């Protein structure tokens, strides 16, 4: 109620910067998220916990509005330059989202599908796509297993889309 044009202006500028990057580096959004979550009160008081929950649902909302390229990046070129912005996202999923944006030891259908869609997009845009997909989903066992535990729950949703 006041936002739904300015959020579209944000989409505009973000897609512009995506083109600018297509023309390796990490995305500024996750750094903003880190800054605000750090500068919150570190306390365990339910006031602080509720504040953190509000702020993380807002972050999830912004990420679901913006494209799925912001999570997984786009076009993993080669094997050495791999897992850029995915590790950035995983730090968030581990530190913050598993506490609040979770249920049943699983993530939410929204951001789960956003992620997997960006993943298939970038991988199919890149070469050796099956092998690269397999690589990142093997690394998820080690860096962010909540994603795999989420994709087990929300699979009958995604499998049509991904197929």
């Amino acid at each position: 109620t006041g936002n739904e044009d300015i959020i579209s202006r944000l989409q505009e500028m973000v897609a512009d910067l995506e083109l600018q990057q297509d023309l390796s580096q990490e995305h500024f959004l996750f750094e903003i998220f880190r800054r605000r979550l750090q500068a919150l009160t570190s306390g365990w008081s339910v006031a602080a916990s509720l504040q953190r929950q509000r702020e993380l649902l807002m972050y999830k909302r912004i990420l679901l509005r913006l494209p799925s390229s912001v999570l997984c990046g786009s076009s993993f070129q080669a094997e050495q330059p791999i897992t850029a912005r995915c590790e950035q996202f995983f730090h968030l999923v581990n530190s913050e989202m598993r506490n609040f944006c979770s249920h049943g030891g699983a993530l939410t259908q929204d951001i789960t599908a956003h992620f997997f869609r960006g993943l298939l997009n970038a991988c199919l845009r890149s070469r050796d796509p099956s092998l690269m997909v397999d690589f990142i989903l093997a690394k998820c066992q080690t860096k962010c297993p909540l994603i795999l535990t989420s994709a087990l729950v929300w699979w009958p949703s995604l499998e049509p889309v991904l197929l």
Binding site: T1, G2, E4, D5, I6
Partner: protein, 50 residues
């Protein structure tokens, strides 16, 4: 276009008036981008006026 031309002429007279313009320069009053954002978010998708 919009409601009463008297209020419109009042707004235009104030806008064109000199001391408004010479005052606007040495200013925290100069409407920072963040302040603009605060007001444009304060307004609604319900009452458009445009």
């Amino acid at each position: 276009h919009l409601p009463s031309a008297d209020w419109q002429r009042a707004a235009l007279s104030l806008w064109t008036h000199r001391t408004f313009r010479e005052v606007l320069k040495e200013e925290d009053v100069h409407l920072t981008y963040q302040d603009w954002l605060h007001l444009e978010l304060e307004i609604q998708p319900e009452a458009d006026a445009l």
